[PDB]
Amino acid sequence: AHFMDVHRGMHGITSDQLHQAHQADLAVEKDENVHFEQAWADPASGTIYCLSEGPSAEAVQRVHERAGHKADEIHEVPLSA
Amino acid sequence: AHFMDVHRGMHGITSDQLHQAHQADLAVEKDENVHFEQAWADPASGTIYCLSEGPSAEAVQRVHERAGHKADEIHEVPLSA
Ligand code: NI
Ligand code: NI
Ligand code: NI
Ligand code: NI
């Protein structure tokens, strides 16, 4: 399955910080067979969008939680175009 | 530049309908130098996410408007990982 998740209220995100948050997820995703495909950030609003492939939203969230940043919002996105 | 926009209230949207919306955007995006790279939809919550490339949020929204569906939110995502 695929998921879009959102982390809000981020303080002063830089490309370095985004790179590291993403790397922290990638480092431990194997333990849930999750694949963090892509992350985009809006540093002005303080928001990180994460696209992942995984068995379930719960799995994706267990990964974020271990990497110390549980997503504020997550939706399965079974449709794409 | 890069943008992520969100449409809500699309509960129960089908693959055909997402494809239709997407095609409607693509059909008029070129005039604004906008390209919709990816569209994902969650028919359960009724949430659509669109990743686009373009000169501004204004342009992207003008395209959505001509296509018949203004986005409820649009944010620039200058950072990606
Ligand atoms: Ni995928
Ligand atoms: Ni497409
Ligand atoms: Ni918002
Ligand atoms: Ni914003």
Author numbering:
A (entry chain B), B (entry chain A): 2 to 82
Source paper text:
Here we showed that the 82-residue hypothetical protein SCO4226 is a nickel binding protein. The overall structure of SCO4226 adopts a ferredoxin-like fold with an α+β structure: five β-strands (β1-5) packing against two α-helices (α1-2). The N-terminal four β-strands β1-4 of one subunit form an antiparallel β-sheet, whereas the C-terminal β5 swaps to the corresponding β-sheet (β1′-4′) of the symmetric subunit, completing an extended antiparallel β-sheet of five strands. Each asymmetric unit contains a dimer of SCO4226, with a buried interface area of about 1100 Å2 on each subunit.
In the structure of Ni-SCO4226, four nickel ions are assigned at the dimer interface, with Ni-1 and Ni-4 on one side, and Ni-2 and Ni-3 on the other. In addition, one citrate molecule is bound to Ni-1 via coordinate bonds. In the dimeric structure of Ni-SCO4226, four nickel ions and one citrate molecule were identified in the electron density map. These four nickel ions are all surface exposed on the dimer interface with varying occupancies from 0.82 to 0.98. Ni-1 and Ni-2 interact with residues within one dimer whereas Ni-3 and Ni-4 are coordinated by residues from two adjacent dimers by symmetric operation. Specifically, Ni-1 is hexa-coordinated by His76-Nδ1, Asp43′-Oδ2, Ser46′-Oγ, and the O4, O7 and O6 atoms of the citrate molecule. Ni-2 is penta-coordinated by His23-Nε2, Ala82′-OXT, and three water molecules. Ni-3 of an octahedral geometry is hexa-coordinated by His3′-Nε2 and Glu38′-Oε2 of one dimer, His12″-Nε2 of the adjacent dimer, and three water molecules (residues from subunit A of the adjacent dimer were labeled with a double prime). Ni-4 coordination is formed by His20′-Nε2 of one dimer, Glu74″-Oε1, Glu74″-Oε2 of the adjacent dimer and three water molecules. The distances for all coordinate bonds are well within the expected range (2.06-2.46 Å). Although the crystal was soaked in a buffer of NiSO4 as high as 0.8 M, the four nickel-binding sites have an occupancy from 0.82 to 0.98.
